[PDB]
Symmetry: C2
Subunit: 335 residues, 2 copies
């Protein structure tokens, strides 16, 4: 695979808004995130659509593609980071400068809607991109949870690439929709003990592919959707969906023979899942859809819309140990 | 194509709930729909999940598939009609009895989420199915709009298959969210603002349905292949402009706009333009990035009332100069 140079303290991070204009609509959280990374010693380059709005998005399809491409063209930038998601990143894909991305590999990072870019770029270039922090939701989060997110971000992106990396497990997490865009918290978020579950036994090792599952529907079937292959580990998360929607997306995967190919599934914690009074969790729905197909599942990985959030390279091998209840990166993912 | 026998007054219609359990949650409107069709002379057979609930759905995946299959097996039924949509019809697809459908073709009709079944059945069997009335939303509608819906339903499904059929244009329509399952007053009525963007005449096989729903079968063996020359028919309901851009770009990435000869946009019920004042056609235009595809914007085959009935998988001719749309290929035996 094509690998970017590793991150280091003092590097320059460029940010872009490929969908929702949250540098305007969540400006307090944006400023908090900017200050957080600056105090860690990073230099920031603001994408050209920062501070702009086109109603539901930051700019036209072409303006958004231009904003991203301009960061790729900047030799001083080591990391290109999403400000926030939305719905509309998939629009950009015909207009990204893939040749320039190949010529100038950088760490591309974000989550949620930005999945369209992470997966699309991998499909076109083979670049290992990252499911991880977006500036506003991730680094604008109030303490204490933001520090745990940051610890994973800096560890994954700066560590020496020798030997496997085994993920730490956040001690507590939350998914509450409070404390979004103000100077002070209303009150502390509920902190839950980590209830991640490892359904299966033994160890499964395979290339991880996926991201935000609802977002994948916007690139599905196209040359920008990476082919899923026998032995892959499927990584999927969603946010604030109804159980009806979750069944639909799981069945979509089933119809596409995904569950005939993959050797394990990682479900990211689902932020504020709406079970419609059924008390069912997404794993129970997945089990019905699987119709007896036995696939080991890591239910509740902290790489999703919940806080804190871990950083995950996409398109390289991971090993899930279902007996020892851990998950590791086993393949080099930065130069 | 595989063709079902035409409907006749007095026939038996069977109904099924492949997703939302609205025979329970919209029981008043359900009863209105049943009574409406019975008054027309139809006999109704209730699918086995009628009156059942499993929270957000009518029953398990397998039970819903069985409900549908049992209607296929019933020799007295000539038309299998959806009660209502939802989100979850795509789950049934591995379990439908496609061989039984081939052995005894029937009129299968519905819309919205039921698109997964209409498209899936066509992909597997070649059966010409219908984007049209579902029992609860369509036939539980109060007069006067329900009468225009019914006129299209009965005309399309009972007419002799001789010569082209040219659609009537409803004089007025509504998308107002009142009088669902309760009336205090009639819905607000709007003049028909359907628009024909293009020139000349385009003829090609129509394919599509509810666009959001298509995402749940996309890429699979149940998604019919879109071919050079097809007319793409798509409608959505109560979506944000952000979602509409996403779905249009999905089509673009899949090279759909390199294949289609025209696009039909169904009227979008209560579209949320996020203050932009933009309509879906304008968003489509941006996404098309210069591609000159003629568009019929605002066809009355969607979640708005009244609703026309449309066979999927047969040739239509859109005459952009004369501002009309016709079915040009035989669609019932």
């Amino acid at each position: 695979p094509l690998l970017a140079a590793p991150l280091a303290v003092g590097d320059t991070i460029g940010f872009f808004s490929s969908s929702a204009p949250a540098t305007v609509t969540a400006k307090n959280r944006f400023f908090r995130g900017v200050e957080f990374l600056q105090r860690k010693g990073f230099k920031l380059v603001s994408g050209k659509l920062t501070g702009k709005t086109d109603f539901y998005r930051s700019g036209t399809i072409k303006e958004r593609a231009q904003e991203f491409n301009e960061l790729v063209y900047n030799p001083d930038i080591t990391c290109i980071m999403s400000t926030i998601g939305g719905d509309n990143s998939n629009s950009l894909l015909p207009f990204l400068d893939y040749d320039a991305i190949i010529a100038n590999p950088k760490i591309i990072i974000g989550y949620s809607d930005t999945t369209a870019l992470l997966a699309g770029i991998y499909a076109k270039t083979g670049l290992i991109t990252f499911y991880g922090p977006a500036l506003i939701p991730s680094f604008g989060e109030h303490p204490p949870l933001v520090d745990i997110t940051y610890e994973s971000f800096i560890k994954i992106l700066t560590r020496k690439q020798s030997g496997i990396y085994t993920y730490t497990l956040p001690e507590k997490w939350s998914d509450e929709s409070i404390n979004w865009n103000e100077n002070k918290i209303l009150r502390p978020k509920k902190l839950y003990k980590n209830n991640c579950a490892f359904y299966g036994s033994g160890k499964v090792e395979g290339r991880v592919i996926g991201g935000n599952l609802n977002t994948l529907t916007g690139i599905w079937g196209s040359e920008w959707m990476p082919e899923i292959r026998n032995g892959d580990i499927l990584f999927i998360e969603d946010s604030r969906k109804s159980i009806a929607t979750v069944e639909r997306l799981f069945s979509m995967l089933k119809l596409n023979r995904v569950f005939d190919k993959v050797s394990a599934i990682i479900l990211g914690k689902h932020e504020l899942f709406d079970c419609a009074g059924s008390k069912r969790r997404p794993y129970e729905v997945l089990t019905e859809v699987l119709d007896g197909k036995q696939i080991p599942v890591l239910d509740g990985f902290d790489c999703s819309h919940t806080h804190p959030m871990l950083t995950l390279p996409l398109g390289v091998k991971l090993a899930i140990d279902f007996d020892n209840k851990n998950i590791s990166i086993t393949e080099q993912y930065l130069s």
